[PDB]
Design a protein around this nucleic acid. Sequence first.
DNA 1: GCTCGGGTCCGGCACTGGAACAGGATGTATATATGTGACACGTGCCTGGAGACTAGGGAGTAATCCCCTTGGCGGTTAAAACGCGGGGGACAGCGCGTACGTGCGTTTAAGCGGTGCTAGAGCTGTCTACGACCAATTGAGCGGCCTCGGCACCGGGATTCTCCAGGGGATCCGGA
DNA 2: TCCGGATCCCCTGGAGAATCCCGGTGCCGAGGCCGCTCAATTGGTCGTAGACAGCTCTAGCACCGCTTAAACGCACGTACGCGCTGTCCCCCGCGTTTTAACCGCCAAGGGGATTACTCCCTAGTCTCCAGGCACGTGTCACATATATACATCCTGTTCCAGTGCCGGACCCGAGC
Lengths: 95, 95, 83, 83, 109, 109, 97, 97
Amino acid sequence: KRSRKESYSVYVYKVLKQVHPDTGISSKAMGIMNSFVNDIFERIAGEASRLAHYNKRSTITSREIQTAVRLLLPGELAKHAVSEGTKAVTKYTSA
Amino acid sequence: KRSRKESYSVYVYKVLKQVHPDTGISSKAMGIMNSFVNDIFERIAGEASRLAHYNKRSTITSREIQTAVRLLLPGELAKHAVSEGTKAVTKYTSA
Amino acid sequence: KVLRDNIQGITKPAIRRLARRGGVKRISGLIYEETRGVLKVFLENVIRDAVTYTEHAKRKTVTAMDVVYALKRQGRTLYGFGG
Amino acid sequence: KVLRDNIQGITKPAIRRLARRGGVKRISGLIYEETRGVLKVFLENVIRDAVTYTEHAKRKTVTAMDVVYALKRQGRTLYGFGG
Amino acid sequence: ARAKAKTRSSRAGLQFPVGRVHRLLRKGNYSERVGAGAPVYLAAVLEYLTAEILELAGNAARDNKKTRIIPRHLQLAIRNDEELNKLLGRVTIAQGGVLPNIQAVLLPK
Amino acid sequence: ARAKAKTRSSRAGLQFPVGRVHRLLRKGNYSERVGAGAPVYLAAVLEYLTAEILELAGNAARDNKKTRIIPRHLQLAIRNDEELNKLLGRVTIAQGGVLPNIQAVLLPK
Amino acid sequence: KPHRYRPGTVALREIRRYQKSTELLIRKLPFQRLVREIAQDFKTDLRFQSSAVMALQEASEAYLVGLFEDTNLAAIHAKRVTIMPKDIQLARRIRGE
Amino acid sequence: KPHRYRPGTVALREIRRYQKSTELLIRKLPFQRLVREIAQDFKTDLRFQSSAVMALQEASEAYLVGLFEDTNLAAIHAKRVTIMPKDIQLARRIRGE
DNA sequence: GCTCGGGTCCGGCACTGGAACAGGATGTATATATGTGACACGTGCCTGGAGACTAGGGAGTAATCCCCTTGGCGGTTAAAACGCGGGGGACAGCGCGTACGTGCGTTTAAGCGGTGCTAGAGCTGTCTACGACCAATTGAGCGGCCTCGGCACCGGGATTCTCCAGGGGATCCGGA
DNA sequence: TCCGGATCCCCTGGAGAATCCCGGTGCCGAGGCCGCTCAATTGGTCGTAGACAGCTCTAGCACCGCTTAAACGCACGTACGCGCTGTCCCCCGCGTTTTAACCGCCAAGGGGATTACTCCCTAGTCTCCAGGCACGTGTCACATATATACATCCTGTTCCAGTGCCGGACCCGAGC
C-alpha cells in the first residue's frame, strides 16, 4: 500500500456532528481545518516550551498551558477555554 | 554567598579589542549586545529546530544552520556570514 | 496607594515632546486625548501579558525579564534588559 | 528554455479585478507597473526562502509544504494547503 | 489479566485524541518531560475552538442556504467575529475571498 | 597520560565559546541530538555579526569623538544600515532615540 | 440611443460582483510562467507542483488585496477616491517593508 | 519691541534637540503611578522592579514615536502639516490594531 | 494757405510698491576647567568545559518505481487589448477664520537625597508524586472503494437598479 | 415696481438592464463501509523534578523635606486647513478585434519516495582542570560649568523697477 499519513479529519467530523448533525464538509474546508489546528497547536506548544524554558522547569505541565492560552487567546475566548479545560481536567483526574 | 548569572560581556569585549584596541564600551550598551546575541541565537536555534522538524531529522547539523543563515539574514550579510562560518568549520574539521 | 485619574498623568507638553521626537511640526489640541487612549490600550495589553507571566511565576513582583518577554512575543522586542 | 518577460502577463484587467476585490472603484493609469514591481519584490522574497527550503531538502522539485513554511516565516501564513 | 483497553479522550469525555497530542508534544521537542493533564487541556481547548468556528461556519452556510460548509463560509465566519479576527488577522484562507464591504464615500449620493 | 586542555573555540579560532553555545543548544531543546560543527558555525556567524556591528558602533562613536560606545551610537549604526534595519526592524534599543530626520515639506520656503 | 451607464456605477457593480465571489482573478498559466521566470533566477531548472503554484498564487493575491484596501483607506484619507502610486508608496512605508 | 520667533521655527529647534537627545520625555513618577494604577485592575498587591518600569517606559516612547512618524507620513500625504485624530486612527488601522 | 495756440499724448522723471541686504539678538556650538564614578583591570575560585572510550543508532547511500511532473498538439472562446468620449475627479487658486505657536508669569509637582521596614526574591535540603521506559496487545484510525444527493451549471421569469426624458414649482428678466 | 411669461432645477415615471430567484439535470466529491496495522493502552518500575519548608537579605515601598523644571495658563498673533470654484484631462464604459488560456488528451521520463544496509558520529560517563564570574580597586572619560564665538533668523534700511504723471512735442483746429 502506502505509508500511513496522519490527519485530523475524523475528529473534526465528530465535532461537526455534535454541533450540527445535518451538515457536511468540503475537503478544502478540512484542509483549512488541519492547517488551523496544527497552527494553533504549534503556537500553544511554542508558548509552552517558552514558559518552561523561562522558569527553569524541566517538565511541561497544565499550569503554563492555562498561562499560554490566557496570554495568547483574547478575553472571553480565553476564560471560556480555561473553563472547558478545567472541567476536562476534573474528569480526567477522576478517570 | 551568591549564584552566577552568565553573560557575553567578556567575549564581546574581546572581539571589540581585536576590531578596535582603542575604543571603550558602556555597560548598558553591553546589555544591549547581550540581548542582541541572545535574540539572534534564539532565532537561529528555533529556525534550525523547524528545519530539522520539516525533514524529520532528529539531529541538528551545520547544514541547516547555514540554511537558516540564508533564511533570516538578507543577501550580503548572508553570503559573507556563510563564508566565515564555512572557513571556520573547515578549521574545526582539520582540528 | 489607590489612585483614580492618572491618564492625565501623561502631560500635554510630554505628548508634544514625543511628537517633536516623531518630527511633528504642528499638533492639534484634540490629539492628546486619543494618544492617551492608545497609550492606555498598549500599556494595558503589555501589562496584562506581564501580570500573566508573573502570576505563572508565582511572584507578587513584576520583573523586567517578563516585561521583555511580553513585549517580544508581541513583536515589539526591546534590548538592554538582560533579555 | 529561458524566459525573459512574464511580468507583463499580470495584465491590467487582472489588477483591476484585484482592486475591485480591494474595493477601489477608480484606478489611476500609473498603478499597474508599480503593482507589478511590488508583486515582483514579494515573489522574490517568498520564493528565495522556498528554494532555500527545497535545496536543503536536497530536492529538485519544491513542495507546497515549503511554500507554506516560507509564508509562515514571513508573517503571512496560509491556511488550506497544509497536509 | 489486562483491563479493557479504554481511551483517555473518553476519560476526559472529549473527542480530540489525548494520545496523539501527547505523542506530538513528546516528539515536537517542547520539553524533555511532559505532564499528564496538559494534553487533555490542550485537546479540550482545540476541540472547543473547532466547535465554535464550525458553529459560525454552519450558521453562515445555513444563512447562505448551503448544507455543506465552504472555505468562503470559513472566511466570512472568522472575519465577522472580532476576537477570532484578533486571533487570525495575519492568516490567509485559501479560496476564501473577503468581507463584503464598500466605503461610505465610495457610495453615490 | 592525558592530553593538555585546549578549547574548541581555539580549534575554531573564534572568540565566542563553542562549549557554552553547544550546551545551550543541548538544553535549548531544538533537537534530540546535535552535530559537532553546528555550534561552531553558529558561533562563527554570531561573531561575524557582532564584529561588524562593533565597527559600525566604533566609527559612529568616533564621529561623535567618544571612545566608549553609546546606545545612541548603536541605534545610529543599526538604522543607517539597510540590511541590519531589515534584520532589526521590530526591535527598539533602550535610550536609542531616532535618526535625525525632518520631512522636506516641514522646512521653510 | 445605445445605453451607457454613468462611470463608477459599473465599477461598483464589479466591486460587489468580485467581492461576493472568491474565484481566482489572475490567469494561472501566465502566473506559472512568471513564477518559473523568477525561480530560475536563483537556481536553474526547478520543478513545481501545481498545488504549490496555486497556493503561492493565493498568498500573492491576498498580499495584493490587503495592500489595496490599505491604499483605499489612504486615498480616502487624502480626501480623494482614486489611488495613485504615492498612496501605495505610503501604504508600503507604513506597513514596514 | 521684544523678540518673537515665527511659528514653526522654535518647533523645528526642539525637533532637532529631541532627535539629537535620547533622554526620556515622560516624567517617571506619574508614569509609574499610572502603571501601578492600571496593573491594579488586573491583579491586587502588585510590586514593581524599577528597571521593569523603565523598560516598559522606552516601550511606551517607542510605540508612541513610531505612531508619530506614521502620523507624520499620513499628514504630509494629505498635503497638510497638522495632524488630527483620524490620522492616528488611520495609522493604527493600517498597522492593524 | 499760413501761422499760431491749445489739447492731448507719450517720454523721462519722480513717486511708490516691492526685494536684496545689513544688523542685532538669541540660541546653539566650542574651548577650557574640574570632579567622579563607572569602566577597566588584577584576583580567588569552582564548575562547566574538555579528554578518553563505548554503544548504538540516525543518517548517508544504493536500487527502484512509479507517480507526478513536464512537454507538446488541437479548439474555443473568454479574456485581453485597443480606441472614443466625456464626464467626474484631481488639483490649483483664493479668501477666511480659526487654532495652535510662541512668549511670559505662576503653581506645583516631579525629582533628589535621606531613612526605616519588611514582603517577597531567591537559595537550599527532602522527598514524594509523577512521569519516562519497556513488553503485549489490540481496536481505533487510515487507505481503498462505492454510491448519491448536494451541488455546479443551464435555462426561463421576476425583480430591483439606473438613468434619462416628460411635469411642477421657483426664479429671473422683460414689459407695462 | 409689480406682474407675467420664460426658463431652469428638481421631481417623477418608465424603459432598459443586470441580477436574483425558481426549477431541471447530470455529475462527481463526500460519507460510509470494510480491511488492515501500528500506535495508544496497561501495567510495572525506577529515577528525579518540583512542591514545600525554611531562612536570609535586599530591593521596593513609604514618608519627608527641600528645590527648582516645567506644566499650566493667558494673550496676541500668523498660518494653515479648508471650503468653494474653475479648469483641464484621465480613466471608465463600451464596442470591436485579437489571442492565448485552457481543457483535454496523450507520451515520456525524472526524481520523490521508499527499503535495506552499514557505519560516523554522538550522547553519555568519568576525571580533571583552567576560564569566566564575583569581587575589589583605581582612575581617567565624560558630565557639568563657564566663557567666548558664530549661525541664523527676523526685521529695519536702502535699492530698484513699476508706474502715474510733469513737461515737451505733435497734431488739430481756429484766426488772420
